[PDB]
Amino acid sequence: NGHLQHHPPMPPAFQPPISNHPAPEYWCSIAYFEMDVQVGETFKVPSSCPIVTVDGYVDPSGGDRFCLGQLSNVHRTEAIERARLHIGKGVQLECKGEGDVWVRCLSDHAVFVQSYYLDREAGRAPGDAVHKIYPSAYIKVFDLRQCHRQMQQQAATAQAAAAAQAAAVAAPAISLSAAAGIGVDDLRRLCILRMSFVKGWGPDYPSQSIKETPCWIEIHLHRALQLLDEVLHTMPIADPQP
Amino acid sequence: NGHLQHHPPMPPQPPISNHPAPEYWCSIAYFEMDVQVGETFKVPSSCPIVTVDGYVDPSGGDRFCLGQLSNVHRTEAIERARLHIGKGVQLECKGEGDVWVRCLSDHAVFVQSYYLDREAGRAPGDAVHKIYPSAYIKVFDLRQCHRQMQQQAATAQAAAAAAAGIGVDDLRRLCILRMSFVKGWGPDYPSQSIKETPCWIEIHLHRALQLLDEVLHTMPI
Amino acid sequence: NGHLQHHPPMPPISNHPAPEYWCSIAYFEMDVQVGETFKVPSSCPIVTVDGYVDPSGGDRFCLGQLSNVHRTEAIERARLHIGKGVQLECKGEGDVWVRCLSDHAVFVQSYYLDREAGRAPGDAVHKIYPSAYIKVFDLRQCHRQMQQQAATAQAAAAAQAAAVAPAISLSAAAGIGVDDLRRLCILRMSFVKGWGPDYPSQSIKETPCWIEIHLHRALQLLDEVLHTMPIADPQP
Numbered sequence: 001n002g003h004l005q006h007h008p009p010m011p012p013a014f015q016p017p018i019s020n021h022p023a024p025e026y027w028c029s030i031a032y033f034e035m036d037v038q039v040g041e042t043f044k045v046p047s048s049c050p051i052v053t054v055d056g057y058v059d060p061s062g063g064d065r066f067c068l069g070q071l072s073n074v075h076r077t078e079a080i081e082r083a084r085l086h087i088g089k090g091v092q093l094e095c096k097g098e099g100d101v102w103v104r105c106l107s108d109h110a111v112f113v114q115s116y117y118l119d120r121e122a123g124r125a126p127g128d129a130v131h132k133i134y135p136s137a138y139i140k141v142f143d144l145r146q147c148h149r150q151m152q153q154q155a156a157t158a159q160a161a162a163a164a165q166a167a168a169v170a171a172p173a174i175s176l177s178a179a180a181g182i183g184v185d186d187l188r189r190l191c192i193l194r195m196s197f198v199k200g201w202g203p204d205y206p207s208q209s210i211k212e213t214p215c216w217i218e219i220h221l222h223r224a225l226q227l228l229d230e231v232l233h234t235m236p237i238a239d240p241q242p
Numbered sequence: 243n244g245h246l247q248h249h250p251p252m253p254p255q256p257p258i259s260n261h262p263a264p265e266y267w268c269s270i271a272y273f274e275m276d277v278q279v280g281e282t283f284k285v286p287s288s289c290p291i292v293t294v295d296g297y298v299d300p301s302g303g304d305r306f307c308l309g310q311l312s313n314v315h316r317t318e319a320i321e322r323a324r325l326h327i328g329k330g331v332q333l334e335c336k337g338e339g340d341v342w343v344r345c346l347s348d349h350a351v352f353v354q355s356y357y358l359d360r361e362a363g364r365a366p367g368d369a370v371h372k373i374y375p376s377a378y379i380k381v382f383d384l385r386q387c388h389r390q391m392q393q394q395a396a397t398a399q400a401a402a403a404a405a406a407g408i409g410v411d412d413l414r415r416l417c418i419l420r421m422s423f424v425k426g427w428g429p430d431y432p433s434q435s436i437k438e439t440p441c442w443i444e445i446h447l448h449r450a451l452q453l454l455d456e457v458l459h460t461m462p463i
Numbered sequence: 464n465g466h467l468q469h470h471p472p473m474p475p476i477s478n479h480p481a482p483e484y485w486c487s488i489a490y491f492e493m494d495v496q497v498g499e500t501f502k503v504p505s506s507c508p509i510v511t512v513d514g515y516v517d518p519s520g521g522d523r524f525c526l527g528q529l530s531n532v533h534r535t536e537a538i539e540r541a542r543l544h545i546g547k548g549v550q551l552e553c554k555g556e557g558d559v560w561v562r563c564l565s566d567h568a569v570f571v572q573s574y575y576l577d578r579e580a581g582r583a584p585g586d587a588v589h590k591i592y593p594s595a596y597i598k599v600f601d602l603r604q605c606h607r608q609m610q611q612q613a614a615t616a617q618a619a620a621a622a623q624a625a626a627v628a629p630a631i632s633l634s635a636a637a638g639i640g641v642d643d644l645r646r647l648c649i650l651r652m653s654f655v656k657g658w659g660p661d662y663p664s665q666s667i668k669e670t671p672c673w674i675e676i677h678l679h680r681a682l683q684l685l686d687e688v689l690h691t692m693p694i695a696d697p698q699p
Contacts, residue, residue: 024301036314041500042281056638058645059686060679061482069638070645070682072675074494074668081642088637088695108637108695180328180348181296181309185321188298188310211314218312222300225310229299238328238348264519276532282499409543410527414516417528437532444530448518451528455517458527 003203004130005122009137018098018148021230023047024222027095030054031218032068034080036211040071051094054217055106056087056197068215083214086198093193099223101142101193105133112200114210115141116150116190127189130202147190147224151231154190158183159235166241175240184232191224245428246370247362251377257338258388261456263287264448267335270294271444272308274320276437280311294443295330295346296423308441323440327423331373339449341382341419345373352427354420354436355381356390367415370428381419387450391416395461409463417450466659468580468587472594475556476606477687481505482679485553488512489675490526492538494668498529509552512674513564514545514654526672541671544655549591557680559600561591565654568592572651572667573599578608585646588659605647605681609688612647616640617692624698634697641689648681 026044030052033039045052049064058070068087073080089106096102105111113131118141122129133139162178170176196216201207210216266284270292273279285292289304298310308327313320329346336342345351351373358371358381373379391413398408422442427433436442484502488510491497503510507522516527526545531538547564554560563569571589576599580587591597620635627633653673658664667673 026300029300031312033314056641057686057689058641058648058682060487060677060682067686069641070648070677072489072649074491085636085638085641108634177348179325181325184296184298184309185324191298191310192312220300220310225298225300229297229307229309232297266518269518271530273532409539410514410516411539411542414528417516418530446518446528451516451518455515455525455527458515 003124003128004132004200005118005124007131007133007137007139009134010139018144019227019230021226024226027099027222028052028093028101029220029222030066030093031220032066032071033211033216033218034073034076034214037073037075039073039076040068045093047095050096051092053090053092053106055090056084080214083198087215090197091195093219097144099142099144099221100140101219101221102138103133103141103195104138105135107197108135109198110134110200111198112196112213113141114194114196117142117146120146120150130200132200133195141193142221142224144224144227148227150190151187151228154183154187155231155235158186170241173242175242177238177240180238181232187228187232188225191221191228193219193221195219243364244362245364245368246372246426246430247358247364248372248374249358249377249379250374255385258385259453259456261452264452266448267339268292268333268341268448269446270306270333271446272306272311272441273437273443274313274316274324274441275439277313277315279313280308290335291332293330293332293346296324296327297330320440323424327441330423331421333419333445337384339382339384339447340380341445341447342378342380343373343421344378345375347423348375349424350374350426352422352425352436352439353379353381356416357382357386360386370426372426373421382447382450384450384453387416388453391450391454391457392461395457395463399461399463407463410458413454413458413463414451417447417454419445419447421445464660465580465582466587467657467661468576468582468589469592470576470589470595470597471592472596476602477556477684479683479687481556482683485557485679486510486551486559487677487679488524488551489677490524490529491668491673491675492531492534492671495531495533497531497534498526505553508554509550511548511550511564513548514542538671541655545672548654549652551676555602557600557602557605557678557684558598559650559676559678560596561599561652562596563591563593566593567655568595569655570653570657571599574608574647575600575604578604588657590657591652599650600678600681602681602684606684606688608647609644609685612644613640613688613692616644629699632697632699635695637695644685644689645682648678648685650676650678652676 027047030043043066053065056069057067059067086109092104094102111133118131166176196213199213207213267287269284271282283306294306296309297307326349332344334342353371359369401407422439425439433439485505488501501524511523515525550562552560569591576589577587616639620639653670656670664670
């Protein structure tokens with residue numbers, strides 16, 4: 001069974017916005033890692049730069065292109081050096097619609113994405129799969145609507161398991177309250193993308209997690225995070241329960 | 243000796259320097275145990291009130307959410323704790339550079355403040371002030387700080403004729419606040435230091451820091 | 464041997480628009496980076512890096528207030544001596560200068576100074592004495608060295624292909640020699656303590672407090688240079 005989903009290149013107004021909330025100043029923020037160490041600062045991408053490029057070149061300017069070639073890292077090994085060599089033209093993260101995200105592998109080597117969307121699209125379990133994107137391939141890795149639906153659902157699901165454990169253990173004088181933020185470290189996960197350049201991880205590979213690959217990045221989508229937060233704030237408040 | 247001060251909720255001059263107002267009145271740095279997580283959050287002077295909660299909106303400005311942040315080194319222990327940060331708290335800046343904390347979290351907040359140290363009559367830095375939910379305590383008085391950094395630098399300087407000689411790295415601490423969410427530290431707790439707690443934040447007060455710079459250029463250490 | 468060098472007090476290359484910042488400075492304590500990367504606006508041609516505490520940012524980086532849970536007594540002793548630190552000035556399109564204001568000299572790592580001193584690239588330490596005001600980076604010289612270096616990289620690679628089963632295609636890496644190149648655009652200086660043979664600190668990252676300075680304009684020029692390299696085309 002393919003834990004590794006392959007993604008080869010495939011050459012070619014009626015519905016309101018998801019939220020009235022105004023767009024963010026940045027549509028996403030990107031943190032680059034070498035193994036379990038973050039190299040360089042977090043790169044923010046203005047919502048006015050619908051396409052950001054992350055290659056292995058050296059221009060520091062910022063804005064819509066985030067270079068990794070010039071970054072230093074005192075702990076860097078000879079392996080990370082080998083890998084960093086092949087990043088090259090890297091990838092393009094394109095933001096369409098309110099907050100949909102696409103990836104364009106411009107590198108000569110395949111990139112390995114970690115996306116909850118792609119997981120669902122492959123009939124796989126959440127987080128159980130590595131999506132390999134072949135050089136030149138151009139595929140959608142995140143759908144705002146799909147994510148939003150999932151959030152409200154998961155959020156509800158949790159809120160219930162809240163009153164569940166609540167009525168569970170629940171004599172003297174004692175009060176109960178839902179953990180101010182149940183299932184949050186999980187809903188946020190739905191708003192974060194990740195991708196490893198050159199090297200892939202998982203069963204078929206020596207790297208077991210992405211934290212074990214020479215050079216990857218973690219993409220935080222803000223418009224998704226805006227929604228989610230807005231969702232968390234539409235839940236019954238933790239009112240002490242005798 | 244009552245190392246832990248208790249702050250339950252109890253319902254209710256001109257500028258010190260001509261020096262210009264800070265771009266940001268403070269900057270917060272969130273840590274998990276002894277690792278800094280996220281970027282350092284900087285609060286504009288036009289945002290006299292900042293909220294640090296456990297939610298997930300990444301926007302800048304007056305709200306710093308620790309919920310969406312990641313940490314490869316994160317542990318179950320830390321996660322379980324982050325679970326209760328909730329409404330978090332509100333750090334407020336009054337006057338030229340005074341600071342007040344307002345706990346909104348359902349659970350206590352343990353602040354490390356020199357100002358409170360004096361009020362509680364404890365030896366400087368030998369106390370952990372526990373802010374109870376809904377409490378609206380004042381944690382930093384600019385004027386006092388100013389009075390203190392001067393004297394402390396004056397004595398640290400005069401102590402050159404010789405320990406008593408403090409360097410920048412001791413005076414700067416007068417301009418910094420620190421607080422832990424949910425968990426507390428001290429002798430009555432497993433965590434002996436703040437950097438040994440699941441989630442806390444170090445707060446740098448910029449107005450106070452300026453005064454200190456202005457002071458290290460008159461009473462050189 | 465002369466690994467340690469002593470420096471006591473004694474037209475546009477591109478149309479590409481001037482960088483937003485002319486350099487990015489990162490502060491380190493041993494092998495740890497304390498504080499955030501300070502970015503200097505091009506409008507602040509001279510930035511000051513001292514050991515004081517104004518957080519104001521802009522044209523002055525203070526390492527005084529910065530915190531580090533890993534800090535030690537040795538690093539604390541060392542920070543004590545940074546004082547007025549240094550001044551990094553930017554002349555022209557991208558030339559960098561250093562003026563030691565500290566009472567203690569500092570030790571820069573400058574590929575340009577290496578060229579001048581007639582020493583193997585990167586194999587030297589330049590000690591800037593208090594009061595000294597010496598040039599440490601030259602764009603023109605840097606630009607010229609880049610191209611010839613990138614070019615040598617290329618040749619070497621293609622010469623690696625010939626050095627090699629017919630039914631298979633071979634190909635050269637995209638980032639060939641890209642590291643050593645970008646290094647030509649970065650400066651490093653250690654306050655108070657030097658490093659090298661004559662020192663108990665064998666490398667910059669073994670010193671209590673140093674900074675790495677990324678020269679922006681130079682980095683752009685190298686980007687263009689890199690984008691003028693023959694696209695990698697797998698030959699069978």
